[PDB]
Amino acid sequence: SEDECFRCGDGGQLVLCDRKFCTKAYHLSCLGLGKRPFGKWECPWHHCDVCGKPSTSFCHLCPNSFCKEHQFSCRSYCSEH
Ligand code: NA
Ligand SMILES: [Zn+2]
Ligand SMILES: [Zn+2]
Ligand SMILES: [Zn+2]
Ligand SMILES: [Zn+2]
């Protein structure tokens, strides 16, 4: 479990991803949630930043990722870095 939000980089009160082997953690506000998830929750690294479909290409520095239809510099990283 990472100790800093994968979206914003800072620490504090973080929620953890339930996908198998995902160590990524997030603030609620950085995800657009007001309360902790109420069942199995998968974090945004796993789904396309455009359409929400399962992602195939992944930023290693933040949860931006894209599916085949919508997919970066070089580990690969997106614009924010
Ligand atoms: Na994503
Ligand atoms: Zn955050
Ligand atoms: Zn995850
Ligand atoms: Zn997509
Ligand atoms: Zn990124």
mmCIF file of N, CA and C in Angstrom, residues 5-81:
data_model
loop_
_atom_site.group_PDB
_atom_site.id
_atom_site.type_symbol
_atom_site.label_atom_id
_atom_site.label_comp_id
_atom_site.label_asym_id
_atom_site.label_seq_id
_atom_site.Cartn_x
_atom_site.Cartn_y
_atom_site.Cartn_z
ATOM 1 N N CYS A 5 -1.111 9.700 -2.339
ATOM 2 C CA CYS A 5 -2.082 9.665 -3.408
ATOM 3 C C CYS A 5 -1.423 9.588 -4.796
ATOM 4 N N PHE A 6 -1.848 8.628 -5.597
ATOM 5 C CA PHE A 6 -1.301 8.493 -6.940
ATOM 6 C C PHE A 6 -1.764 9.612 -7.865
ATOM 7 N N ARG A 7 -2.905 10.276 -7.598
ATOM 8 C CA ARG A 7 -3.325 11.380 -8.447
ATOM 9 C C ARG A 7 -2.563 12.651 -8.083
ATOM 10 N N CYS A 8 -2.521 13.025 -6.810
ATOM 11 C CA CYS A 8 -2.009 14.346 -6.477
ATOM 12 C C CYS A 8 -0.633 14.383 -5.845
ATOM 13 N N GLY A 9 -0.108 13.260 -5.408
ATOM 14 C CA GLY A 9 1.219 13.191 -4.834
ATOM 15 C C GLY A 9 1.344 13.378 -3.329
ATOM 16 N N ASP A 10 0.310 13.844 -2.641
ATOM 17 C CA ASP A 10 0.396 14.128 -1.220
ATOM 18 C C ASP A 10 -0.167 13.019 -0.358
ATOM 19 N N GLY A 11 0.125 13.107 0.944
ATOM 20 C CA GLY A 11 -0.304 12.094 1.879
ATOM 21 C C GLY A 11 -1.640 12.419 2.510
ATOM 22 N N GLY A 12 -1.933 11.702 3.588
ATOM 23 C CA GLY A 12 -3.076 12.018 4.425
ATOM 24 C C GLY A 12 -4.091 10.895 4.504
ATOM 25 N N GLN A 13 -5.371 11.179 4.286
ATOM 26 C CA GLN A 13 -6.412 10.163 4.463
ATOM 27 C C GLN A 13 -6.675 9.608 3.092
ATOM 28 N N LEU A 14 -6.244 8.353 2.849
ATOM 29 C CA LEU A 14 -6.212 7.697 1.538
ATOM 30 C C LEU A 14 -7.085 6.442 1.504
ATOM 31 N N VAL A 15 -7.667 6.177 0.352
ATOM 32 C CA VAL A 15 -8.433 4.970 0.114
ATOM 33 C C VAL A 15 -7.628 4.076 -0.799
ATOM 34 N N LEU A 16 -7.751 2.777 -0.604
ATOM 35 C CA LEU A 16 -6.967 1.814 -1.348
ATOM 36 C C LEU A 16 -7.803 1.075 -2.373
ATOM 37 N N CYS A 17 -7.160 0.786 -3.488
ATOM 38 C CA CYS A 17 -7.727 0.055 -4.601
ATOM 39 C C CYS A 17 -7.917 -1.422 -4.289
ATOM 40 N N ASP A 18 -9.054 -2.017 -4.724
ATOM 41 C CA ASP A 18 -9.283 -3.411 -4.433
ATOM 42 C C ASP A 18 -8.855 -4.353 -5.555
ATOM 43 N N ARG A 19 -8.387 -3.850 -6.697
ATOM 44 C CA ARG A 19 -7.938 -4.747 -7.734
ATOM 45 C C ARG A 19 -6.784 -5.577 -7.188
ATOM 46 N N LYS A 20 -6.752 -6.866 -7.527
ATOM 47 C CA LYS A 20 -5.662 -7.739 -7.109
ATOM 48 C C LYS A 20 -4.334 -7.141 -7.482
ATOM 49 N N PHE A 21 -3.450 -7.086 -6.494
ATOM 50 C CA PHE A 21 -2.066 -6.627 -6.497
ATOM 51 C C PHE A 21 -1.887 -5.121 -6.736
ATOM 52 N N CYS A 22 -2.950 -4.327 -6.844
ATOM 53 C CA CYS A 22 -2.789 -2.885 -7.017
ATOM 54 C C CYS A 22 -2.471 -2.282 -5.676
ATOM 55 N N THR A 23 -1.423 -1.455 -5.616
ATOM 56 C CA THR A 23 -0.940 -0.852 -4.374
ATOM 57 C C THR A 23 -1.274 0.621 -4.339
ATOM 58 N N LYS A 24 -2.091 1.065 -5.288
ATOM 59 C CA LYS A 24 -2.259 2.480 -5.477
ATOM 60 C C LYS A 24 -3.317 2.965 -4.517
ATOM 61 N N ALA A 25 -3.070 4.137 -3.936
ATOM 62 C CA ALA A 25 -3.933 4.760 -2.919
ATOM 63 C C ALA A 25 -4.313 6.184 -3.309
ATOM 64 N N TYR A 26 -5.474 6.678 -2.834
ATOM 65 C CA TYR A 26 -6.003 7.966 -3.320
ATOM 66 C C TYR A 26 -6.769 8.698 -2.240
ATOM 67 N N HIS A 27 -6.758 10.039 -2.272
ATOM 68 C CA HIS A 27 -7.754 10.788 -1.530
ATOM 69 C C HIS A 27 -9.149 10.629 -2.149
ATOM 70 N N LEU A 28 -10.156 10.691 -1.286
ATOM 71 C CA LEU A 28 -11.557 10.697 -1.739
ATOM 72 C C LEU A 28 -11.855 11.894 -2.640
ATOM 73 N N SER A 29 -11.410 13.074 -2.236
ATOM 74 C CA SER A 29 -11.657 14.266 -3.035
ATOM 75 C C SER A 29 -11.000 14.206 -4.416
ATOM 76 N N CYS A 30 -9.832 13.532 -4.523
ATOM 77 C CA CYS A 30 -9.104 13.423 -5.789
ATOM 78 C C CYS A 30 -9.844 12.456 -6.722
ATOM 79 N N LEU A 31 -10.720 11.645 -6.193
ATOM 80 C CA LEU A 31 -11.483 10.698 -6.999
ATOM 81 C C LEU A 31 -12.889 11.177 -7.310
ATOM 82 N N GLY A 32 -13.310 12.300 -6.759
ATOM 83 C CA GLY A 32 -14.696 12.688 -6.858
ATOM 84 C C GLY A 32 -15.674 11.905 -6.020
ATOM 85 N N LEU A 33 -15.233 11.277 -4.953
ATOM 86 C CA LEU A 33 -16.134 10.612 -4.025
ATOM 87 C C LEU A 33 -16.210 11.408 -2.736
ATOM 88 N N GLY A 34 -17.378 11.384 -2.105
ATOM 89 C CA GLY A 34 -17.586 12.046 -0.821
ATOM 90 C C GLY A 34 -17.443 11.128 0.385
ATOM 91 N N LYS A 35 -17.544 9.816 0.136
ATOM 92 C CA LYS A 35 -17.486 8.797 1.182
ATOM 93 C C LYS A 35 -16.663 7.634 0.639
ATOM 94 N N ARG A 36 -16.119 6.841 1.554
ATOM 95 C CA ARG A 36 -15.341 5.694 1.127
ATOM 96 C C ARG A 36 -16.224 4.749 0.311
ATOM 97 N N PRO A 37 -15.641 4.023 -0.639
ATOM 98 C CA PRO A 37 -16.430 3.128 -1.498
ATOM 99 C C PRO A 37 -17.208 2.105 -0.686
ATOM 100 N N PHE A 38 -18.405 1.756 -1.176
ATOM 101 C CA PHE A 38 -19.326 0.890 -0.451
ATOM 102 C C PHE A 38 -19.315 -0.586 -0.879
ATOM 103 N N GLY A 39 -18.418 -0.964 -1.758
ATOM 104 C CA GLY A 39 -18.194 -2.345 -2.111
ATOM 105 C C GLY A 39 -16.859 -2.392 -2.784
ATOM 106 N N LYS A 40 -16.673 -3.396 -3.645
ATOM 107 C CA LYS A 40 -15.419 -3.493 -4.380
ATOM 108 C C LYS A 40 -15.259 -2.260 -5.259
ATOM 109 N N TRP A 41 -14.137 -1.570 -5.098
ATOM 110 C CA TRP A 41 -13.843 -0.372 -5.867
ATOM 111 C C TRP A 41 -12.510 -0.595 -6.582
ATOM 112 N N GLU A 42 -12.481 -0.354 -7.882
ATOM 113 C CA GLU A 42 -11.225 -0.327 -8.644
ATOM 114 C C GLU A 42 -10.827 1.093 -9.068
ATOM 115 N N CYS A 43 -9.558 1.415 -8.887
ATOM 116 C CA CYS A 43 -9.093 2.756 -9.032
ATOM 117 C C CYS A 43 -8.950 3.128 -10.515
ATOM 118 N N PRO A 44 -8.758 4.407 -10.813
ATOM 119 C CA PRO A 44 -8.777 4.877 -12.229
ATOM 120 C C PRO A 44 -7.628 4.427 -13.103
ATOM 121 N N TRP A 45 -6.555 3.848 -12.548
ATOM 122 C CA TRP A 45 -5.470 3.352 -13.360
ATOM 123 C C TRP A 45 -5.934 2.248 -14.253
ATOM 124 N N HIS A 46 -7.010 1.584 -13.874
ATOM 125 C CA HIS A 46 -7.377 0.393 -14.611
ATOM 126 C C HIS A 46 -8.289 0.681 -15.796
ATOM 127 N N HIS A 47 -8.772 1.925 -15.950
ATOM 128 C CA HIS A 47 -9.789 2.178 -16.985
ATOM 129 C C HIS A 47 -9.497 3.486 -17.736
ATOM 130 N N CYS A 48 -10.011 3.532 -18.991
ATOM 131 C CA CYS A 48 -9.572 4.503 -19.983
ATOM 132 C C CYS A 48 -9.980 5.870 -19.532
ATOM 133 N N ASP A 49 -9.045 6.808 -19.508
ATOM 134 C CA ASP A 49 -9.353 8.201 -19.169
ATOM 135 C C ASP A 49 -10.394 8.845 -20.073
ATOM 136 N N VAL A 50 -10.672 8.279 -21.242
ATOM 137 C CA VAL A 50 -11.648 8.828 -22.165
ATOM 138 C C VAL A 50 -13.008 8.133 -22.014
ATOM 139 N N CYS A 51 -13.038 6.814 -22.014
ATOM 140 C CA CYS A 51 -14.277 6.073 -22.171
ATOM 141 C C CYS A 51 -14.571 5.165 -20.998
ATOM 142 N N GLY A 52 -13.615 4.924 -20.122
ATOM 143 C CA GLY A 52 -13.851 4.068 -19.002
ATOM 144 C C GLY A 52 -13.651 2.593 -19.240
ATOM 145 N N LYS A 53 -13.472 2.150 -20.486
ATOM 146 C CA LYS A 53 -13.195 0.756 -20.820
ATOM 147 C C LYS A 53 -11.848 0.347 -20.241
ATOM 148 N N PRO A 54 -11.616 -0.962 -20.109
ATOM 149 C CA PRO A 54 -10.335 -1.444 -19.578
ATOM 150 C C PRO A 54 -9.115 -0.921 -20.325
ATOM 151 N N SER A 55 -8.149 -0.420 -19.568
ATOM 152 C CA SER A 55 -7.009 0.223 -20.175
ATOM 153 C C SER A 55 -5.929 -0.770 -20.609
ATOM 154 N N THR A 56 -5.175 -0.369 -21.624
ATOM 155 C CA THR A 56 -4.089 -1.164 -22.182
ATOM 156 C C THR A 56 -2.760 -0.439 -22.157
ATOM 157 N N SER A 57 -2.730 0.872 -21.879
ATOM 158 C CA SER A 57 -1.491 1.642 -21.872
ATOM 159 C C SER A 57 -1.541 2.525 -20.638
ATOM 160 N N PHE A 58 -0.436 2.654 -19.864
ATOM 161 C CA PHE A 58 -0.504 3.185 -18.504
ATOM 162 C C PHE A 58 0.638 4.156 -18.225
ATOM 163 N N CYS A 59 0.290 5.318 -17.714
ATOM 164 C CA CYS A 59 1.304 6.167 -17.158
ATOM 165 C C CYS A 59 1.906 5.538 -15.890
ATOM 166 N N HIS A 60 3.231 5.558 -15.765
ATOM 167 C CA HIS A 60 3.781 4.994 -14.526
ATOM 168 C C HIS A 60 3.822 5.980 -13.357
ATOM 169 N N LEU A 61 3.485 7.250 -13.593
ATOM 170 C CA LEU A 61 3.576 8.324 -12.612
ATOM 171 C C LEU A 61 2.221 8.807 -12.095
ATOM 172 N N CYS A 62 1.110 8.444 -12.729
ATOM 173 C CA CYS A 62 -0.210 8.878 -12.304
ATOM 174 C C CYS A 62 -1.226 7.919 -12.921
ATOM 175 N N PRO A 63 -2.496 8.018 -12.549
ATOM 176 C CA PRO A 63 -3.425 6.977 -12.986
ATOM 177 C C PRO A 63 -3.946 7.178 -14.411
ATOM 178 N N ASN A 64 -3.374 8.089 -15.180
ATOM 179 C CA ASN A 64 -3.798 8.225 -16.568
ATOM 180 C C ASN A 64 -3.402 6.955 -17.334
ATOM 181 N N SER A 65 -4.336 6.463 -18.121
ATOM 182 C CA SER A 65 -4.186 5.265 -18.928
ATOM 183 C C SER A 65 -5.305 5.272 -19.957
ATOM 184 N N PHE A 66 -5.173 4.416 -20.969
ATOM 185 C CA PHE A 66 -6.045 4.456 -22.128
ATOM 186 C C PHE A 66 -6.222 3.029 -22.629
ATOM 187 N N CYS A 67 -7.374 2.801 -23.218
ATOM 188 C CA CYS A 67 -7.680 1.596 -23.937
ATOM 189 C C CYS A 67 -7.095 1.626 -25.362
ATOM 190 N N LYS A 68 -7.260 0.524 -26.087
ATOM 191 C CA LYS A 68 -6.604 0.418 -27.392
ATOM 192 C C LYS A 68 -7.076 1.512 -28.342
ATOM 193 N N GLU A 69 -8.351 1.869 -28.258
ATOM 194 C CA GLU A 69 -8.902 2.816 -29.207
ATOM 195 C C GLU A 69 -8.377 4.211 -28.956
ATOM 196 N N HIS A 70 -7.987 4.521 -27.720
ATOM 197 C CA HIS A 70 -7.651 5.894 -27.385
ATOM 198 C C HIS A 70 -6.209 6.102 -26.976
ATOM 199 N N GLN A 71 -5.361 5.107 -27.145
ATOM 200 C CA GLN A 71 -3.984 5.243 -26.688
ATOM 201 C C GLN A 71 -3.142 5.873 -27.814
ATOM 202 N N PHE A 72 2.399 9.905 -25.198
ATOM 203 C CA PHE A 72 3.167 9.204 -24.165
ATOM 204 C C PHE A 72 4.638 9.242 -24.482
ATOM 205 N N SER A 73 5.456 9.564 -23.492
ATOM 206 C CA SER A 73 6.901 9.609 -23.642
ATOM 207 C C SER A 73 7.497 8.403 -22.918
ATOM 208 N N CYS A 74 8.814 8.215 -23.074
ATOM 209 C CA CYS A 74 9.531 7.170 -22.349
ATOM 210 C C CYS A 74 10.931 7.607 -21.902
ATOM 211 N N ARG A 75 10.197 3.926 -18.395
ATOM 212 C CA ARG A 75 8.744 3.697 -18.290
ATOM 213 C C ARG A 75 7.967 4.799 -19.031
ATOM 214 N N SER A 76 6.785 4.465 -19.565
ATOM 215 C CA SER A 76 5.972 5.439 -20.289
ATOM 216 C C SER A 76 5.324 6.424 -19.322
ATOM 217 N N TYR A 77 5.221 7.671 -19.729
ATOM 218 C CA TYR A 77 4.562 8.663 -18.888
ATOM 219 C C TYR A 77 3.829 9.655 -19.766
ATOM 220 N N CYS A 78 2.822 10.275 -19.189
ATOM 221 C CA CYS A 78 1.923 11.162 -19.894
ATOM 222 C C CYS A 78 2.361 12.626 -19.797
ATOM 223 N N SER A 79 1.460 13.534 -20.172
ATOM 224 C CA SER A 79 1.829 14.948 -20.316
ATOM 225 C C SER A 79 2.192 15.613 -18.980
ATOM 226 N N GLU A 80 1.487 15.270 -17.897
ATOM 227 C CA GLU A 80 1.637 15.947 -16.615
ATOM 228 C C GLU A 80 3.041 15.864 -16.026
ATOM 229 N N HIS A 81 3.980 15.238 -16.741
ATOM 230 C CA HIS A 81 5.323 15.017 -16.208
ATOM 231 C C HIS A 81 6.391 15.260 -17.312
#
